[PDB]
Amino acid sequence: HFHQVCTPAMLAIARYLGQKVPAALSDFAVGIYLSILALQYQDFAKRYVPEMMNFLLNTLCALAPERAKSKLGNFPVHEPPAGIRIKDATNTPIRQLNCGDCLRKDELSPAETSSLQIAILSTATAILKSAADTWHKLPAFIESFQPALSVAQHLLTKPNASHLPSSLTSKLNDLASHLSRLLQLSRLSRRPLELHHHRPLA
Amino acid sequence: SLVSGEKTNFNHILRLLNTNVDGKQKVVYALTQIKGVGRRYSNLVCKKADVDLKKRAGELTSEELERLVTIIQNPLAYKI
Amino acid sequence: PKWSLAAAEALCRVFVRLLAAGTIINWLRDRLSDYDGVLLSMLQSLAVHALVLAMAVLKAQAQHLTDREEAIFPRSFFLEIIAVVLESPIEHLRGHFSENFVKKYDDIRFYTFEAIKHFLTEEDVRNNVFNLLLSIEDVPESNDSLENFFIERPPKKKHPLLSLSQHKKQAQEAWLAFMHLGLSKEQRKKVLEVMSASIAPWFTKPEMLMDFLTDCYNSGGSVSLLALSGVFYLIQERNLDYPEFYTKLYSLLDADILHSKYRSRFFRLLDTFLASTHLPAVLVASFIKRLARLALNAPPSAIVVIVPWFYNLFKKHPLTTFMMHRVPRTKEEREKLEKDGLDDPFLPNETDPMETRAIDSCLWEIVQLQSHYHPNVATICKIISEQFTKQAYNLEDFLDHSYGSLLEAEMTKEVKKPPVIEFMIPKHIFTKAAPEEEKKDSLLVSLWDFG
Amino acid sequence: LGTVLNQALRTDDSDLLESCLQTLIIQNTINRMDSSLAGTLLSKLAARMHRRPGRAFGLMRWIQWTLVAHGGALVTQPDLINRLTELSRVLEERSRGLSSLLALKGKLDMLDAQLKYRKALKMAG
Amino acid sequence: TNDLFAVTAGPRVEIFSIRKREPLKTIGRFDSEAHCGEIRPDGRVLVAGEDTGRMQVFDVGQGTRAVILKTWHIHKQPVWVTKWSPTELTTLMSCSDDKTVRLWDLPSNDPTRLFTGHTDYVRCGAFMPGSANSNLLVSGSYDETVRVWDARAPGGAVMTFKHADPIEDVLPLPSGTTLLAASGNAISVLDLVAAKPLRLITNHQKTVTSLSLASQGRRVVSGSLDGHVKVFETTSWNVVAGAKYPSPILSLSVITAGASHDDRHLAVGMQSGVLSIRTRLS
């Protein structure tokens, strides 16, 4: 419940997570890194990181195939300032993320940025899948993962599936089906609240 | 639809020099509720304090609350 | 030019002495005019001591360059001094001028305001005069609260310099001149920050602030959050309205305000706005449910603010505690609810708060936020979970809390209480598969390549 | 001050009316304000026209700019012509003396001009 | 005929003299608040409701008399308004803030009747003036609803009108035909014989606080958080006159003299805690 060292590091993750509107794909990558770090921190002690879920949905909309238009959760949608978003590169496949991505490159090639962004999207799909798996409890499930389904079907739209490869499309379809099944689970399990059923004193 | 409630929160427990528990009955009733302080001495305190007897506890702002506090610490430099 | 400065201060000495003492008088005043020129040069030169020399000879001019008893001093020459002060880049000159003279004297304040009015009637200089207007903060309360003048405390007893309404009028005219010439975006931001405390008091009639504030308030967003302070200011002082106030606030509170830096001031306005008395249960339940759905995305440094306020609202109205504890009453709906799970009748993104159905919702948000990574946040939802013992939870013990505050808290803990460690560490910290140990790999290794 | 104007005139305020009338921004306020409220303004400024005819420098410029920004309001709702019709009688009381109000000045302003000379004989004297 | 009328501001009530315009007697026997003091039109007994939900009833002579007759704590929830019946010497109504409006007779220790139907904060209500208007009661809520019940059938409301604003105040006309419902800056006259709305009138920036009847059942007065008091006709309901007060007012009444009910003076009770009384004498 408390540690003098451990959960202060969780607080550090909280700061650099809820803050840091991303200005570079290095910031995207370090956010992904601390997202899976906070995953490992909060596994089998299923606590909740709203800053993590916010930043996850934020990079899903900030990779911006077409645009984040309207009615996309209550997480703060920010802007990709230097055009930090995917282009019509459907041939660059996914890959696995590396610590070199923690280095900035303004001379970076568009092919490298497209492969890097598609890798970021695939890894983020895996992150949201694992987060839904470890957070299938916690009865605010629907109210915390309906924006996930929103950004999911928004990127499932054809003006975004045009830029997305079929690998990212299949990953996102699997995540969407899993999330719909789990939303059905949480909706069937949803109950009203009776908190203070107080035991009367003598 | 916008009516100021800057005074409606008054019926609650107050902390003092000796006790931490004090509701509202009267200003002199609270000062009798204070240990070691009686009714007539409490009347002396409020007439010296200029605080109106008609009011109750919780109706009293900070500077005059602490004025009652100071004059119940020292009863001598104020004449008695 | 130090010996030039010595000659200058000795010249001020002999000038104030010849004035305080008193075909030739033409040159006797020509001395003073060429000295006005010399003082302009020595002010554009040290300049702080030259400014002291300037205020001294201005006093001498008021004192004895007239035949009446009335101590009139040159508004024109003082306006030239004003122009060269606001045009010179010396920030220390401007600071010495503000602190030592304008923040002290009411004559200097008032005639400074009228000189500003003329000088702005006729961008760097805009920022200079803007920082000086921001430097003037305090408002006198009464005509006997003025009570200090550099020269000529007037025996008129109806003098405009003796009347506090004329001082606010002249500062108001300087402020109207600045806003009508138009100020920068960030300048507008700082004004909207510090308006209700040191600017909006300085106006006789702040109704033009009502107009411009409802403009920048219906503009939307963070500028509306900043403008809400002035709207509430005018509602208190000169009670003009807004048509549908609580619905505009219901539209105003949104996702990014809990990450905004001005959320503390906004929360204080929020507490008084919902601490008003004549509020319906549907309305306060609407606000509670929306800020709950927002607490699903809030920072912990904002959760610590919002939930003791939730406790206090549940205290101030007990009917909304069916969002706290809703008992199904009949076995028929009990059967229907165990058959199909309950759906939230709360309507998100609904326009009007009195017609959102946050009535018959529940605070599943806080029963989930109980499972938080931060232990004091876990307890600050546990106070919602347990019991309503205390009469009130003050908000000043929860405002001004940031991650900086949380980190210095965990740092101002003991340097080390003897800690605990995780035993049986796997050697496959960075190993990709580890299939001979039957331990599931680190997902960070499964999703990040290390080679 | 346009919302201040709108507020005052739809609750029938005189103090808030006076706060707007004590003070360029006049143009701003009237191009801010609305239409039927401009008709209400016109009616009660006609009341002002009758009850106090001193220095007109502000409010007659105000009704100018009223008819500038929302003069076309009262053609789009024309049924309240007695709003305007009641201006339309005050104006000609306001011009009665102008049959000889210049016959005022010229005999008098020469007598002014005579002391300007009798001053001019003496300050040099 | 009397020189008696009572005010409340906070946890106490205060009966005042008409003649000397002075606070005749202050009563602070209330635990938490005092939401509405009301004296039976006989003229010796007051009834009031605190924020604890309790209501008290007690008698007073013509000086400092505070003899406690009875009380009730059955609402378990703040009772906002209570009123005697203008016909019987025995029965009263009380809107509690929860949803409940209910009817009492002074003999027993139980309410005679109880109506529900409202949903949000119900905070105004009174009886129905009229000789034919025998057993009828209206109550308005923060649910933007006014409902009228007959007493003989304790089912639902006989009628209900919904506004777009939380309904601030309610009163009907002594002719027994119509009622004014004050909701926001606007107040609606609504017919009760045919159950039809007659006319909406607004002349206010802020929401009307209190409304009242004037000279001979003949002119209505509205007072709003704009500090604004207005008088209107009861035939044309046009703007007749009005005045301003330096604080947002909360309550108002003009009170009369005696036979023929010629008005003595206005008392308004404001947010800044001032009861002003402007008097006309004949």
Side-chain angles (χ1 to χ4, degrees), chain A residues 1-65 67-87 89-202, chain B, chain C residues 1-415 418-451, chain D, chain E residues 1-2 4-13 15-30 32-49 51-58 60-104 106-109 111-119 121-142 145-164 166-167 170-190 192-225 227-232 234-282:
Chain A
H1 185 65
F2 168 67
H3 207 265
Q4 286 194 16
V5 176
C6 179
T7 169
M10 191 45 226
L11 210 47
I13 301 150
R15 172 93 194 203
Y16 193 63
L17 187 39
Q19 304 328 289
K20 191 258 293 185
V21 167
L25 285 165
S26 280
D27 263 347
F28 278 75
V30 65
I32 292 308
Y33 191 90
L34 61 96
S35 73
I36 61 172
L37 258 55
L39 276 172
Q40 190 262 2
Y41 277 37
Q42 275 64 243
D43 280 330
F44 63 85
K46 292 161 299 176
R47 300 166 169 112
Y48 171 61
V49 188
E51 297 142 317
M52 183 160 158
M53 266 313 296
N54 278 281
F55 203 88
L56 296 173
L57 304 171
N58 202 36
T59 176
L60 307 173
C61 56
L63 278 197
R67 191 40 93 177
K69 177 159 55 187
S70 45
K71 187 43 197 65
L72 175 49
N74 292 316
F75 65 100
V77 174
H78 305 295
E79 63 272 13
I84 317 184
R85 70 191 68 98
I86 61 169
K87 67 201 161 54
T90 183
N91 54 2
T92 60
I94 72 178
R95 55 104 186 167
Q96 198 173 5
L97 288 184
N98 69 303
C99 296
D101 298 338
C102 317
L103 309 181
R104 306 179 192 164
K105 278 157 301 300
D106 62 335
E107 81 301 335
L108 201 42
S109 67
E112 211 276 342
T113 64
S114 47
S115 45
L116 193 138
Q117 276 167 339
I118 284 183
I120 278 179
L121 203 146
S122 45
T123 56
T125 306
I127 293 163
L128 271 293
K129 270 294 295 297
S130 46
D133 295 328
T134 190
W135 273 349
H136 72 114
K137 302 305 216 311
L138 306 98
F141 185 84
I142 305 173
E143 297 79 23
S144 316
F145 290 118
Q146 192 45 247
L149 184 71
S150 297
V151 62
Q153 296 169 352
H154 171 73
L155 304 195
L156 275 156
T157 57
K158 294 172 66 177
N160 309 320
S162 45
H163 297 67
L164 294 168
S166 65
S167 44
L168 293 186
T169 310
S170 44
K171 272 187 168 299
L172 206 171
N173 195 16
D174 183 75
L175 168 55
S177 43
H178 172 65
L179 199 142
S180 59
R181 187 251 171 279
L182 289 200
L183 285 186
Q184 291 165 0
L185 175 133
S186 161
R187 183 208 46 248
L188 261 67
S189 298
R190 192 165 290 272
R191 304 268 154 275
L193 290 179
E194 287 181 352
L195 181 41
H196 314 270
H197 266 306
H198 279 327
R199 183 185 290 269
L201 173 55
Chain B
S1 177
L2 290 69
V3 194
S4 176
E6 63 155 320
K7 281 179 58 184
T8 77
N9 262 27
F10 82 114
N11 43 5
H12 285 337
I13 284 304
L14 275 298
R15 278 80 62 187
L16 289 103
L17 72 167
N18 47 348
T19 183
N20 294 153
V21 169
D22 214 19
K24 61 99 194 171
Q25 293 294 109
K26 278 309 294 181
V27 300
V28 299
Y29 203 79
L31 184 53
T32 52
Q33 177 51 238
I34 295 283
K35 283 177 315 173
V37 179
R39 307 167 178 85
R40 282 80 179 269
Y41 285 165
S42 298
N43 310 126
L44 266 89
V45 179
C46 53
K47 307 166 221 304
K48 204 190 227 163
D50 176 276
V51 54
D52 297 331
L53 181 46
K54 325 305 160 274
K55 304 307 144 66
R56 331 288 209 96
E59 311 200 285
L60 192 80
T61 170
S62 43
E63 82 298 335
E64 43 204 28
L65 291 152
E66 308 324 298
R67 172 165 71 215
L68 323 179
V69 182
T70 64
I71 67 178
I72 201 63
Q73 316 313 320
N74 78 309
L76 196 42
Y78 307 101
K79 56 102 173 184
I80 206 164
Chain C
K2 301 183 178 182
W3 283 90
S4 194
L5 200 74
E9 53 89 18
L11 190 63
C12 307
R13 284 206 160 195
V14 292
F15 278 166
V16 304
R17 289 288 84 76
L18 65 91
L19 278 189
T23 79
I24 177 61
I25 54 185
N26 48 335
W27 179 63
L28 300 194
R29 295 149 181 173
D30 287 326
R31 299 154 146 190
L32 294 177
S33 48
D34 66 62
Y35 184 56
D36 305 332
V38 165
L39 261 195
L40 191 146
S41 54
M42 288 324 283
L43 271 182
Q44 285 185 355
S45 75
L46 267 77
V48 46
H49 304 295
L51 182 53
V52 188
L53 299 184
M55 52 87 60
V57 294
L58 274 175
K59 188 262 182 182
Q61 213 288 338
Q63 191 39 250
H64 263 288
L65 277 193
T66 180
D67 311 329
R68 290 153 277 166
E69 60 90 21
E70 186 165 9
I72 43 166
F73 81 110
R75 315 158 55 246
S76 43
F77 172 59
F78 176 59
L79 198 142
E80 274 84 73
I81 294 178
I82 279 302
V84 65
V85 158
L86 303 159
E87 209 53 52
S88 198
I90 316 174
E91 54 91 20
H92 196 275
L93 181 147
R94 289 178 209 129
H96 170 82
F97 178 54
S98 46
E99 302 161 86
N100 299 62
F101 303 124
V102 189
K103 290 299 294 188
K104 308 294 164 301
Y105 285 136
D106 297 334
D107 314 324
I108 302 187
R109 272 196 306 105
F110 184 85
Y111 284 88
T112 296
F113 294 149
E114 76 162 13
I116 293 151
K117 185 254 296 180
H118 185 254
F119 180 57
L120 310 186
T121 313
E122 315 170 351
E123 191 38 74
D124 193 342
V125 58
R126 157 184 323 177
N127 290 2
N128 303 330
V129 308
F130 174 58
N131 300 313
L132 266 295
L133 310 172
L134 293 203
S135 317
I136 294 297
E137 308 154 28
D138 54 351
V139 188
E141 288 319 298
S142 79
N143 294 309
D144 52 350
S145 81
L146 316 179
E147 62 88 26
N148 71 318
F149 304 120
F150 176 48
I151 313 156
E152 211 291 304
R153 316 196 152 76
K156 321 296 174 172
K157 312 327 293 172
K158 299 296 307 306
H159 207 63
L161 178 140
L162 278 166
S163 67
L164 175 134
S165 179
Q166 283 284 314
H167 284 258
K168 316 173 310 218
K169 193 265 301 176
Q170 189 51 252
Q172 176 174 1
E173 292 300 323
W175 270 106
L176 262 292
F178 191 72
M179 62 86 64
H180 187 269
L181 66 86
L183 74 169
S184 297
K185 159 183 305 305
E186 192 70 27
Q187 290 184 331
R188 181 209 311 190
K189 303 311 164 286
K190 323 315 300 184
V191 179
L192 294 158
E193 292 145 39
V194 306
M195 162 179 297
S196 316
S198 293
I199 316 170
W202 256 116
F203 301 103
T204 64
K205 297 288 103 173
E207 289 89 303
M208 72 290 298
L209 291 88
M210 163 60 206
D211 187 26
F212 165 73
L213 266 283
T214 196
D215 173 90
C216 272
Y217 187 79
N218 291 297
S219 277
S222 316
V223 72
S224 288
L225 320 174
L226 204 55
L228 180 57
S229 42
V231 185
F232 173 58
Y233 182 87
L234 56 90
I235 286 162
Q236 293 306 108
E237 272 57 73
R238 181 57 185 82
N239 209 359
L240 323 177
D241 61 329
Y242 190 83
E244 309 311 305
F245 201 63
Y246 278 110
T247 79
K248 180 66 159 61
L249 316 172
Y250 190 52
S251 46
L252 197 44
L253 81 165
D254 62 32
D256 205 6
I257 69 177
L258 310 103
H259 296 83
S260 88
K261 206 208 173 189
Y262 322 110
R263 69 183 194 204
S264 198
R265 286 159 69 107
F266 159 71
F267 286 150
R268 296 169 170 185
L269 315 173
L270 171 84
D271 309 333
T272 173
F273 279 149
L274 299 173
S276 181
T277 63
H278 273 250
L279 279 54
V282 300
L283 180 144
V284 286
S286 162
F287 291 144
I288 286 170
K289 202 61 199 320
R290 175 171 284 253
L291 177 53
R293 178 65 183 86
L294 264 58
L296 273 182
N297 314 278
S301 315
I303 293 162
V304 63
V305 194
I306 61 190
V307 301
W309 186 62
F310 292 161
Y311 172 78
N312 307 336
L313 310 170
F314 289 137
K315 295 200 85 83
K316 80 156 304 185
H317 289 288
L319 288 179
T320 181
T321 68
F322 299 116
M323 279 220 285
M324 183 62 108
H325 198 123
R326 181 166 329 274
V327 187
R329 320 186 207 179
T330 70
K331 61 97 178 180
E332 307 90 61
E333 183 42 40
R334 289 175 191 272
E335 292 156 297
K336 174 58 187 64
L337 190 139
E338 59 87 30
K339 172 184 182 309
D340 288 345
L342 179 135
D343 311 328
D344 191 15
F346 174 62
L347 309 179
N349 304 10
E350 185 75 22
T351 77
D352 47 345
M354 73 283 300
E355 293 319 300
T356 80
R357 273 201 329 277
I359 301 296
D360 310 329
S361 61
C362 315
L363 199 32
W364 300 286
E365 291 94 347
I366 212 51
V367 82
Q368 192 269 338
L369 189 45
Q370 277 280 59
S371 44
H372 196 256
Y373 56 89
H374 183 120
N376 253 319
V377 185
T379 68
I380 215 74
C381 318
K382 276 154 203 215
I383 61 182
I384 281 85
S385 77
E386 186 39 79
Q387 265 174 0
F388 271 29
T389 303
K390 190 67 180 186
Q391 70 273 9
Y393 284 176
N394 62 333
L395 276 302
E396 60 267 34
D397 294 334
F398 304 107
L399 292 148
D400 195 18
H401 278 83
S402 177
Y403 304 101
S405 78
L406 318 171
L407 270 291
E408 58 83 22
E410 65 90 21
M411 185 274 314
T412 44
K413 295 206 76 42
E414 193 188 5
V415 302
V420 289
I421 308 95
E422 186 265 345
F423 284 162
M424 197 65 104
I425 168 170
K427 195 180 287 292
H428 303 91
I429 300 165
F430 285 172
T431 306
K432 298 216 66 176
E436 306 321 300
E437 72 169 358
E438 211 48 53
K439 200 168 192 170
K440 190 49 188 50
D441 57 71
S442 298
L443 266 293
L444 62 93
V445 191
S446 81
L447 307 179
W448 276 62
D449 59 309
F450 299 135
Chain D
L1 213 60
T3 180
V4 180
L5 245 163
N6 275 335
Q7 279 199 42
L9 268 293
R10 68 189 186 228
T11 156
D12 192 357
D13 204 327
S14 171
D15 199 10
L16 199 58
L17 177 59
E18 102 75 24
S19 62
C20 313
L21 281 182
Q22 272 305 315
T23 64
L24 68 169
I25 120 109
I26 298 96
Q27 291 84 300
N28 303 9
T29 54
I30 308 183
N31 59 61
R32 269 308 252 144
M33 72 193 262
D34 302 328
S35 61
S36 103
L37 296 129
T40 69
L41 203 113
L42 171 138
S43 305
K44 257 228 291 296
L45 73 87
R48 191 83 194 180
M49 288 316 156
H50 173 88
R51 95 234 184 180
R52 209 55 86 185
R55 14 182 125 153
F57 305 118
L59 13 123
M60 297 198 7
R61 180 182 183 267
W62 261 89
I63 170 108
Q64 235 236 357
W65 286 106
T66 317
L67 297 231
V68 175
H70 318 301
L74 211 49
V75 358
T76 346
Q77 180 133 331
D79 45 75
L80 265 178
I81 49 152
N82 285 223
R83 293 192 151 173
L84 317 102
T85 315
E86 279 18 78
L87 278 302
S88 79
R89 286 154 73 78
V90 179
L91 273 52
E92 29 267 309
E93 183 202 332
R94 281 172 110 185
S95 47
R96 301 288 174 91
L98 205 56
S99 13
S100 123
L101 187 144
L102 272 292
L104 232 135
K105 185 172 188 294
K107 3 194 240 230
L108 153 96
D109 109 299
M110 198 215 22
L111 269 242
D112 156 77
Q114 291 181 356
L115 339 131
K116 316 229 17 126
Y117 169 62
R118 294 297 180 88
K119 179 268 297 179
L121 290 171
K122 297 321 282 162
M123 31 32 94
Chain E
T1 57
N2 62 334
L4 287 76
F5 61 103
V7 314
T8 173
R12 307 174 232 165
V13 302
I15 320 174
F16 277 58
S17 166
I18 311 178
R19 268 76 204 162
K20 200 203 319 302
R21 312 206 296 158
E22 60 94 24
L24 177 62
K25 188 208 177 308
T26 44
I27 301 150
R29 292 303 189 270
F30 313 105
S32 70
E33 219 274 319
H35 281 55
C36 54
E38 274 93 2
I39 169 170
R40 202 182 70 212
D42 182 28
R44 279 166 312 168
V45 186
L46 269 297
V47 55
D51 213 38
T52 176
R54 192 176 292 116
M55 45 80 56
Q56 305 182 10
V57 70
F58 40 78
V60 51
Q62 280 73 20
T64 297
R65 291 197 45 87
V67 285
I68 43 161
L69 262 292
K70 212 176 164 42
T71 192
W72 282 307
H73 203 44
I74 303 178
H75 284 309
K76 322 307 297 192
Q77 203 271 352
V79 54
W80 266 78
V81 63
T82 195
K83 288 285 289 315
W84 312 83
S85 165
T87 58
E88 299 188 0
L89 314 98
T90 42
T91 190
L92 295 94
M93 59 72 51
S94 58
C95 305
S96 176
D97 207 3
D98 40 357
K99 280 166 208 157
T100 46
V101 293
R102 54 181 75 153
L103 279 78
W104 301 74
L106 175 56
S108 190
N109 213 6
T112 53
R113 291 296 156 84
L114 171 63
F115 303 118
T116 181
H118 274 304
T119 42
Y121 285 176
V122 51
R123 272 198 210 175
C124 177
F127 289 81
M128 190 47 226
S131 298
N133 302 110
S134 173
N135 44 2
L136 323 173
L137 275 147
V138 188
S139 188
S141 57
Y142 281 15
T145 44
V146 288
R147 320 172 185 277
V148 62
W149 297 265
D150 185 3
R152 277 173 290 105
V158 166
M159 193 59 205
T160 296
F161 312 101
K162 182 185 174 46
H163 289 52
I167 310 196
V170 187
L171 69 85
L173 165 62
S175 94
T177 309
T178 186
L179 180 143
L180 269 295
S183 303
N185 325 333
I187 305 93
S188 49
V189 60
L190 321 98
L192 323 170
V193 179
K196 63 97 178 177
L198 199 145
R199 164 193 181 174
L200 186 50
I201 312 100
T202 188
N203 287 267
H204 316 83
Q205 268 312 105
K206 290 178 178 282
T207 77
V208 50
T209 76
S210 315
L211 86 173
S212 286
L213 190 81
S215 159
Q216 297 310 126
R218 280 192 313 128
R219 263 172 196 81
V220 303
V221 299
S222 158
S224 79
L225 283 71
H228 271 186
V229 300
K230 308 308 151 220
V231 67
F232 295 88
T234 44
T235 65
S236 58
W237 280 280
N238 307 340
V239 298
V240 183
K244 196 196 257 164
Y245 288 87
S247 176
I249 318 169
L250 324 170
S251 298
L252 58 93
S253 168
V254 177
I255 82 167
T256 64
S260 62
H261 308 267
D262 45 350
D263 46 352
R264 290 295 91 196
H265 46 75
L266 64 93
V268 306
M270 289 193 240
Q271 210 286 319
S272 312
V274 286
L275 189 87
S276 188
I277 300 97
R278 307 204 148 272
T279 318
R280 178 187 168 274
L281 183 155
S282 174

